[PDB]
């Protein structure tokens, strides 16, 4: 129950909740309150230190940019014109957290500890397959509704911050998302290796809002489907139905989603903008290169046919195909597409004539500001590698998010290993050890 009459030590205490539904419900609805509490508390904490004329990536804001991407509290070019959406999002999350925690403390100490004798619709069993598929169906429907909320924000409520808009980003309303399955599933057939890229390779908000419509309705149909269907034989012979197996699958899911998330936040710049988070990995290298070229060109040097101290270009090089790309060690990045670098790209890589005469102010200053702010830093937040001295302090927000979600994903992978093993072993029944009297190996032919 709550001593060593349950079959778990204190350090495995939460496992006493496998057969008590109410106590388990209280535990989860109380923990939801913490996740929400930190959302609100952290953006209020960030905002108390926020200087709203200083770019967001050089002051450490990592929850205000998510709101900025939705094009609230921002003008054109990614400046702050008012700070009210930040305060209201944070404070309303912090307030709703109490309502969640209240339900927590009630169901944990006052509520019936079994909901199968109380209710027969909040009454559930991990071995009753029908109840799990029905709850799964509910949960798919509230996720379906959740997916259409972004589409509403995109089409009706002032749209999203488009960073591909003319003359730097601007908030733009989607007035025509793609509803074309060809383009949509085409992303899932691409190779994950560099050059091409998987779903991470999104480059416009039409596909984003379009895909949100697509995934929303497949899960509304699938959610309706699992209320009106009972699992099939091959499906039942492919699984272990236990209260822990579901947890194992879900840990497997969360570890995959973390690997995908850390890949996103490091490379993309459509859904994680360059005006609310810093430049990306290649973006700074390409910027350094671009501003160097621009500087040395004003002296009247020939940079278009210039050969190195190892030959093969000095400012520009040939890629394998034969496009004009950047030289030196900026020859491993030419898969980089930036909003600010693309008006200069000719029909086969950069066109040196466009460089001489079609430089707009915001482009060359974007390139120059991104040069001195490249993803590096240390674990005590001071910029650069170990040779340079502490006098500038930079850590890209990209690196914080990337490192955190990476290590949490690796640990969620090993947790999936653990819980799958426990669920499998407990099913067959040798998870308490090996029975003394009879053992398998004592009834198996000896290898020679």
């Amino acid at each position: 129950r709550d001593q060593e009459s349950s079959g778990f030590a204190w350090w495995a205490g939460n496992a006493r909740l496998i057969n008590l539904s109410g106590k388990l419900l209280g535990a989860h609805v109380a923990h939801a309150g913490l996740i929400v509490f930190w959302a609100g508390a952290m953006t209020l904490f960030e905002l108390a230190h926020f200087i709203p004329e200083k770019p967001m990536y050089e002051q450490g804001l990592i929850l205000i940019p998510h709101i900025a991407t939705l094009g609230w509290g921002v003008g054109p070019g990614g400046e702050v014109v008012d700070t009210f959406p930040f305060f209201v999002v944070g404070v309303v999350h912090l307030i709703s957290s109490a309502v969640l925690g209240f339900g927590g403390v009630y169901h944990a100490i006052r509520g019936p500890e079994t909901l199968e004798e109380y209710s027969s619709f909040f009454g559930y069993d991990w071995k009753d397959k029908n109840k799990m598929t029905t709850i799964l169906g509910f949960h798919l429907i509230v996720l379906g509704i959740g997916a259409l909320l972004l589409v509403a924000k995109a089409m009706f409520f002032g749209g999203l911050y488009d960073t591909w808009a003319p003359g730097g980003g601007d908030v733009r309303v989607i007035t025509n998302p793609t509803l074309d399955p060809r383009v949509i599933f085409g992303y899932l057939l691409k190779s994950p290796f560099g050059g091409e890229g998987w779903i991470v390779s999104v480059n416009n908000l039409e596909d984003v809002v379009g895909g949100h419509i697509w995934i929303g309705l497949i899960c509304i149909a699938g959610g309706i489907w699992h209320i009106l269907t009972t699992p099939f034989g091959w499906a039942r012979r492919a699984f272990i139905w236990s209260g822990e197996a579901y947890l194992s699958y879900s840990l497997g899911a969360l570890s995959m989603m973390g690997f995908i998330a850390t890949c996103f936040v490091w490379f993309n710049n459509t859904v994680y903008p360059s005006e609310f988070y810093g430049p990306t990995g290649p973006e700074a290298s390409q910027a350094q290169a671009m501003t160097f070229l621009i500087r040395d060109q004003k002296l009247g040097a020939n940079v278009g046919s210039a050969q190195g101290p190892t030959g093969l270009g000095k400012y520009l090089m040939r890629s394998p195909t034969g496009e004009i790309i950047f030289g030196g060690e900026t020859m491993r990045f030419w898969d980089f597409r930036g909003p600010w670098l693309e008006p200069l790209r000719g029909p086969n890589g950069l066109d040196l004539n466009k460089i001489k005469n079609d430089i707009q102010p915001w482009q060359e200053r974007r390139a120059a500001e991104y040069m001195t702010h490249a993803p590096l830093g240390s674990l005590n937040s001071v910029g650069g590698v170990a040779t340079e001295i502490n006098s500038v302090n930079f850590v890209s927000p990209r690196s914080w998010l990337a490192t955190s979600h990476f290590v949490l994903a690796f640990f969620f992978l090993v947790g999936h290993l653990w819980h799958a093993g426990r669920a499998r072993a407990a099913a067959a029944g040798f998870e308490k050890g090996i029975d003394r009297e009879s053992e398998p190996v004592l009834s198996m032919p000896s290898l020679d």
């Binding site: 307030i95 109490a98 209240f102 403390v105 009630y106 100490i109 006052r110």
Partner: protein, 62 residues
């Protein structure tokens, strides 16, 4: 209005504090919990009231 706004907000922080220590021992202890059902109900009713009256008063101050 602003003194009244601060006064109401200060009572809210205090009454949240009094609530967050109060209701766990209200449900938990076994030698009175059923007499505290009215205290926690009126207390939580006043809490959501106090929250929302401070909330609407924000736009009348700033």
């Amino acid at each position: 209005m602003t003194i009244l706004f601060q006064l109401a907000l200060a009572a809210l922080v205090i009454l949240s504090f009094v609530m967050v220590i109060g209701v766990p021992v209200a449900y938990a202890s076994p030698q009175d919990w059923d007499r505290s059902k009215q205290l926690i109900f009126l207390g939580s009713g006043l809490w959501i009231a106090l929250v929302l009256v401070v909330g609407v008063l924000n736009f009348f101050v700033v």
